[PDB]
């Protein structure tokens with residue numbers, strides 16, 4: 001019904017739900033053109049494998065050269081978070097190569113709506129405006145986190161992208177309405193000029209986010225059989241965070257001191273060991289880049305020591321695991337106030353990005369999290385209950401995703 005140009009932000013926390021939403025609007029009949037840079041074209045292979053080439057197009061433009069980004073790196077998950085000001089400045093120069101492409105197409109084939117990252121809306125709206133196309137913006141964070149940020153006096157360098165999202169046709173966020181009704185309504189009322197918000201979450205996968213650095217067949221064979229259900233502790237701080245040698249040693253001491261089973265996800269960083277020094281255990285495994293949803297959904301896994309990024313909370317909530325929160329950056333503190341404080345559905349077991357756990361204190365808390373009766377898990381699971389009715393079918397988000405796809409046609 002609508003031809004949709006999808007322009008995701010080259011970061012995992014963003015692109016991973018932005019493509020599930022791409023699949024979701026695809027399933028209800030949309031046509032989709034995805035604007036992607038060359039190396040990132042391959043993340044589209046999974047989704048491309050599910051849809052007919054007339055329903056799924058791929059526009060690939062070269063990554064704009066920036067002195068500060070290493071060659072071959074087109075995705076912020078491989079950079080220091082401070083590179084985002086450079087990713088922004090570089091990606092904005094996709095503006096007239098995108099204008100060139102659209103202006104050489106038969107006007108009938110132009111899209112009816114652009115579904116671009118809210119992070120890119122300063123220039124995406126200018127394109128959308130040149131061709132008189134509605135620009136709907138997307139965020140992988142919830143309305144609460146949005147409400148705090150948009151309310152600040154001094155925002156920039158995020159100021160332009162926040163001003164641009166308000167002036168967009170509407171906003172799509174990966175959250176369900178019954179988690180945060182006060183904050184949807186406030187953000188809907190005075191942070192979107194035309195008052196159009198779409199809560200469509202939690203978006204569920206369709207080998208996601210990247211090809212895992214250990215075969216996901218093999219990690220399941222480790223997990224089943226793990227002797228004991230609700231006994232394994234998942235440790236993963238997401239895409240962006242890379243712990244220091246100092247903290248990684250203190251966290252590793254806690255996982256050894258609590259004699260719990262666990263899988264520990266460790267990332268890398270690119271510029272221009274540290275996880276020392278053992279497996280004196282076969283009660284563990286290390287990374288790489290891991291298959292989170294398969295672990296968290298697995299029955300043998302019942303805890304998650306997380307950065308409390310917004311995507312990873314929803315995966316751990318859909319997996320039905322206790323959330324042990326250690327916020328570090330970005331929205332993680334918003335989401336500690338919402339999930340640890342207001343709603344009381346996770347325990348804060350770490351303080352700052354540069355916090356260093358007490359290896360003994362953290363070891364008791366890890367062993368206890370492997371307990372079914374914990375009250376913060378039953379409060380979390382009562383949110384899992386509201387979130388499942390919202391996603392399908394007839395819930396807030398099935399209806400928002402139906403209403404979104406319909407609206408894109410006007």
Ligand SMILES: O=c1ccn([C@@H]2O[C@H](COP(=O)(O)OP(=O)(O)O)[C@@H](O)[C@H]2O)c(=O)[nH]1
Nearest residue numbers: 013209238239240289290292309310311312
């Ligand atoms: O080893 C990894 C690291 C991350 N992810 C996925 O990548 C996303 C991380 O984004 P999130 O919003 O949790 O945090 P961000 O990376 O934006 O800080 C989530 O969907 C995870 O399930 C994964 O599958 N394996």
